[PDB]
Amino acid sequence: PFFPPLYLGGPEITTENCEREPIHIPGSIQPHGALLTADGHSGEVLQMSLNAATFLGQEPTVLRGQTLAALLPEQWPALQAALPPGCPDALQYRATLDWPAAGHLSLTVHRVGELLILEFEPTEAPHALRNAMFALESAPNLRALAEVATQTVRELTGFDRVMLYKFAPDATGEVIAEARREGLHAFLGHRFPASDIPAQARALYTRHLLRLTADTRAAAVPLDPVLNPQTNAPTPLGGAVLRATSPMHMQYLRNMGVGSSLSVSVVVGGQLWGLIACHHQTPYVLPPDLRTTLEYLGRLLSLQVQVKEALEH
Amino acid sequence: DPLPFFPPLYLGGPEITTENCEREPIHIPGSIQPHGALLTADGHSGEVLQMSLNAATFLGQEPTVLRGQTLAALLPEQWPALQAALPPGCPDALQYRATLDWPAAGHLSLTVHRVGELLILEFEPTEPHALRNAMFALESAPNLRALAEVATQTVRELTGFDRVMLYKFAPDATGEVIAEARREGLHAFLGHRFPASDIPAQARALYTRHLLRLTADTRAAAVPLDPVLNPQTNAPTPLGGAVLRATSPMHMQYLRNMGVGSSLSVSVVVGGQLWGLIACHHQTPYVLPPDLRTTLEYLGRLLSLQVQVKEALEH
Ligand SMILES: *C/C=C1/C(=C/c2[nH]c(/C=C3[NH+]=C(/C=C4\NC(=O)C(C=C)=C4C)C(C)=C\3CCC(=O)O)c(CCC(=O)O)c2C)NC(=O)[C@H]1C
Ligand SMILES: *C/C=C1/C(=C/c2[nH]c(/C=C3[NH+]=C(/C=C4\NC(=O)C(C=C)=C4C)C(C)=C\3CCC(=O)O)c(CCC(=O)O)c2C)NC(=O)[C@H]1C
Numbered sequence: 001p002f003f004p005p006l007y008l009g010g011p012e013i014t015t016e017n018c019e020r021e022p023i024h025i026p027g028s029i030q031p032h033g034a035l036l037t038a039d040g041h042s043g044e045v046l047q048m049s050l051n052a053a054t055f056l057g058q059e060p061t062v063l064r065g066q067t068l069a070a071l072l073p074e075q076w077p078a079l080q081a082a083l084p085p086g087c088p089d090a091l092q093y094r095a096t097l098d099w100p101a102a103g104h105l106s107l108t109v110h111r112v113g114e115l116l117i118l119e120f121e122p123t124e125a126p127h128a129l130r131n132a133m134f135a136l137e138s139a140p141n142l143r144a145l146a147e148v149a150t151q152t153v154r155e156l157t158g159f160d161r162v163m164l165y166k167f168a169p170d171a172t173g174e175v176i177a178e179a180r181r182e183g184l185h186a187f188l189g190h191r192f193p194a195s196d197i198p199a200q201a202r203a204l205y206t207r208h209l210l211r212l213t214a215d216t217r218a219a220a221v222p223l224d225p226v227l228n229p230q231t232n233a234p235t236p237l238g239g240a241v242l243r244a245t246s247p248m249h250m251q252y253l254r255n256m257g258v259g260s261s262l263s264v265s266v267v268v269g270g271q272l273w274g275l276i277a278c279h280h281q282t283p284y285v286l287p288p289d290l291r292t293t294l295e296y297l298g299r300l301l302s303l304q305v306q307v308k309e310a311l312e313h
Numbered sequence: 314d315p316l317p318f319f320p321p322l323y324l325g326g327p328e329i330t331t332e333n334c335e336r337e338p339i340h341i342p343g344s345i346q347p348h349g350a351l352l353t354a355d356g357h358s359g360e361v362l363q364m365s366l367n368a369a370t371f372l373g374q375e376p377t378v379l380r381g382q383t384l385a386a387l388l389p390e391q392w393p394a395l396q397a398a399l400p401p402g403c404p405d406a407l408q409y410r411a412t413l414d415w416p417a418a419g420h421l422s423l424t425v426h427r428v429g430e431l432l433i434l435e436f437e438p439t440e441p442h443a444l445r446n447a448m449f450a451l452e453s454a455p456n457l458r459a460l461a462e463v464a465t466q467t468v469r470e471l472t473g474f475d476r477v478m479l480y481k482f483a484p485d486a487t488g489e490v491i492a493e494a495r496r497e498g499l500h501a502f503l504g505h506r507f508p509a510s511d512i513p514a515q516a517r518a519l520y521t522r523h524l525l526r527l528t529a530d531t532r533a534a535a536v537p538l539d540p541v542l543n544p545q546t547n548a549p550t551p552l553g554g555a556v557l558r559a560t561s562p563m564h565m566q567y568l569r570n571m572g573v574g575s576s577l578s579v580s581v582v583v584g585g586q587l588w589g590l591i592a593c594h595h596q597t598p599y600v601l602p603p604d605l606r607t608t609l610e611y612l613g614r615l616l617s618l619q620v621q622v623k624e625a626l627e628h
Contacts, residue, residue: 082446091453094442127410130607131398133614138407269625292445296611299448303618307585 002200005234007226013248018198023246024238028220030213032285033121033242036063037228037235040085040114043068043076047223047235049242055120057101068116072097075107083111089239090207094288096123106288112236115228119242121288128156129293136300142308146177149301153276154179156293157286159262161279163187167272170194171202176274204238206272209265209298210291213245215283216253216260220244260284262291264298268305276301315514321549323541329563335513339561340553343542344535346528348600349437349557352379353543353550356401356430359383359392362544365557367536371436373417376539384432388413391423399427405554406522410603412439422603428551431543435557440602443471448615457623461492464591464616469494471608472601474577474593478502481589485509486517488589519553520580521587525610528560528576530598531568535559556606575599577606579613583621591616 002022004010013021029035034055037047045063053060068076075095082093089112097105097120106123109116132152139145150162161184164177171194178188205211221244228235237243253261260280266273276298318338320326329337345351350371353363361380369376384392391411398409405428413421413436422439425432447467454460461479469477476499479492486509490502520526536559543550552558568576575595581588591613601609 088453090449092449093446096441126412130410130610131408133611134406134408135398138404270622292442295445295448299615299618303614306621310584 008234013246018195018248019200021198021200021246021248022234023201024204024236024243025234026220026237026244026246027226027234028222028244029119029237029240029242030215030244031218031221032214033119035120035223035240035242036118037223038068038116038118039230040083040111040116043071043116045071046115046229047225049221050224051221052120055102055105055122056099068118072107079109079116083109083116085111085114087111089236092239108241108288110239112239114230115235117235117237117240119240121242122285123288125289128152129296132156132297133300136297136304139304139308142305142312143176145301145304145308147179149276149297150177150179153278153294153297157262157278157290159278159280159284160184161187163277163279164266164274165277166274171197173197173274202272205265205275206267206270208239209267210263210295211241211243212260212262212286212291213250213253214260214285216250216258218283257281262286262294264294266298266302266305268302273302273305318515324549329561334510334563335515337515337561337563338549339516340519340551340558341549342535342552342559342561343549344537344559345552345555345557346530346559347533347536348529349435351436351538351555351557352434353538354384354432354434355545356427356432359385361387362431363538363540363550365536366539368436371418371421371438372415384434388423395425395432399425399432401427401430403427405551408554410607424556424603426554428554430545431550433550433552433555435555437557437603439604443467444608444611447471447612451612451615451619452622454619454623457620457627458492460616460619460623462494464612465492465494468591468593468609468612472577472593472605474575474595474599475499476502476594478592478594479581479589480592482587486512486514488512491589517587520590521582521585523554524580524582524613525606526556526558526578527601527606528565528568529600531565531574531576532598572596577601577609579609581613581617581620583617583624588617588620 003020005022005025007027029049031051034052035049036045038045045066048063052063089110092108092110094108097107099105104123106121108119135148139148146164150164153162161180163175165173166176167173174191175187258279259282262278264276316336319336321338321341323343345365347367350368351365352361354361360383405426409425411423413423415421420439422437424435450463454463465477465479476495478490480488481491482488487506489506493503573594574597577593579591
């Protein structure tokens with residue numbers, strides 16, 4: 001099972017008890033965006049991120065009483081239809097708000113039980129994803145596929161290091177491809193132990209396919225209240241992208257000199273086959289539309305990985 | 314019985330009947346549909362070899378001035394990118410896409426692929442989160458039928474076609490409409506099954522490699538290539554990879570009896586085999602711009618993944 005979260009008085013994590021930290025309920029978000037939680041029937045704002053006022057331009061109390069109906073007039077019916085009660089929590093709906101305070105905000109929503117979870121991020125507004133698509137499909141073999149993948153992500157994103165990391169039967173990992181800026185250590189062809197990705201994370205990532213950490217020195221921003229009023233229990237945030245990262249992982253990233261990280265699941269036959277992993281040496285907020293392209297590449301790559309191992313076995 | 318291709322009409326081959334369908338060489342019609350323009354050019358030197366007769370009106374240049382320059386002089390910014398994305402020896406399914414600003418014709422969608430030592434270049438006029446939301450809605454479908462229904466309804470909402478079907482093949486190559494989303498007043502095709510000779514066996518081999526094709530006007534005349542034969546070889550030009558390829562006149566007649574003016578279709582390919590077809594009908598002529606087609610090409614890949622995922626939850 002899991003320990004209780006810190007903010008509920010559970011034990012601090014060490015390298016003895018990695019497999020039991022409760023990552024999906026850290027009660028906080030990364031600061032490049034804002035998070036609200038709302039009631040699925042009334043649309044009543046229940047929890048908000050302490051930085052909401054920044055992105056939404058709203059007096060702190062005004063929000064925690066208001067309703068999505070009133071708060072997002074055009075979006076609120078779309079949310080009802082898009083996310084019916086009973087739908088999986090992996091289902092996301094996104095729209096773009098041309099919001100008064102901040103030019104354009106990206107809105108992504110999904111439902112956990114009776115709770116909707118809204119995330120707000122700055123956004124903006126050609127053929128590389130189509131070109132990348134055919135380039136993945138014309139690769140002769142798994143090795144060539146892997147090199148095209150990492151190189152494509154690197155040209156689309158500018159990350160300093162993009163690796164394709166591949167799982168072995170006993171959760172042992174290996175870097176089979178890597179595109180990187182000049183002058184970095186090379187992680188190509190290395191293997192790492194199975195505890196580097198603990199079992200409770202491996203389950204979450206077969207379900208939700210993208211996660212990121214935009215700044216490894218930034219402090220988390222708490223939800224308020226931290227417990228869901230509906231349940232007086234921790235809000236599950238496993239599916240939110242703004243979800244705050246475990247401090248045990250952020251400490252490992254600083255020991256490496258990494259300012260920003262992103263990763264994408266490659267799920268083959270209902271099992272996590274590997275990851276597209278991105279390093280950057282400095283902080284880096286990847287804009288939602290660009291992330292969506294990596295989301296597409298994850299499904300493309302997942303399909304082609306199966307095609308290409310089939311022509312070996 | 315499977316039989317090898319007739320020579321094309323313009324090399325003295327016979328005309329086609331219900332008796333010799335599987336023998337029409339559909340990959341070398343020697344012509345394009347008129348809503349765009351097609352050039353061919355030597356893979357290495359860049360010399361322009363063939364062009365469709367209509368290429369003057371889409372590119373605003375005399376045919377002889379166009380043929381007298383190399384791609385390095387006609388598309389200076391694109392030629393080096395053309396060389397890097399389509400190296401010699403690469404498969405003919407590998408495509409490269411770029412948008413152009415052309416003086417006379419506005420914004421131009423350039424799609425390139427290579428066949429042998431020949432670069433084929435197609436030019437078409439080109440013009441929020443629907444795809445992303447569509448992607449998530451496809452993956453949360455409980456089951457195959459739900460998935461079929463979401464897919465055909467998404468595709469209609471994105472294109473507006475009168476009738477969008479998901480057509481699934483059986484082991485003996487018969488087919489059955491397993492889902493459709495159609496316009497009020499149209500008669501359903503849901504549940505009908507059709508014989509194996511409705512898609513002949515030379516077309517099934519073509520449709521596993523190239524994944525999307527379309528007829529924009531069932532009543533337009535084809536636009537010839539000029540010259541019709543490749544000066545490289547004095548053999549016909551492989552146009553099998555070209556979305557601008559003109560359609561067999563046999564199939565264009567079947568559609569006019571149906572009252573159909575426009576046709577599009579996307580292959581769903583599973584385990585290296587053609588699992589089925591996303592098929593779209595329209596009663597009037599109808600041209601879908603290339604960036605919109607790209608969204609359909611993405612969905613055809615996503616659906617192929619999702620179908621496997623759904624079938625494996627089924628034993
Ligand atoms: C006592 C627990 C430890 C631990 C926990 C932990 N690790 C993750 C996530 C990841 N760890 C990864 C391992 C690597 N990243 C690299 O860059 C390299 C080498 C180049 C390795 C071997 C990876 C790829 C992830 C994925 C997450 C991501 O995208 O960054 C978590 C999950 C945190 C969360 O879900 O919020 C946790 C709890 N890691 C250890 O090394 C031990 C000390
Ligand atoms: C003697 C040859 C005949 C023939 C030729 C032919 N047919 C195709 C391609 C297709 N035929 C299809 C059949 C149907 N279309 C429909 O709308 C329905 C029912 C709703 C059916 C049963 C389909 C789906 C295709 C694929 C292409 C498309 O969807 O438009 C070809 C290939 C054309 C080419 O690649 O250039 C050919 C040569 N059809 C016959 O029925 C016989 C008489």
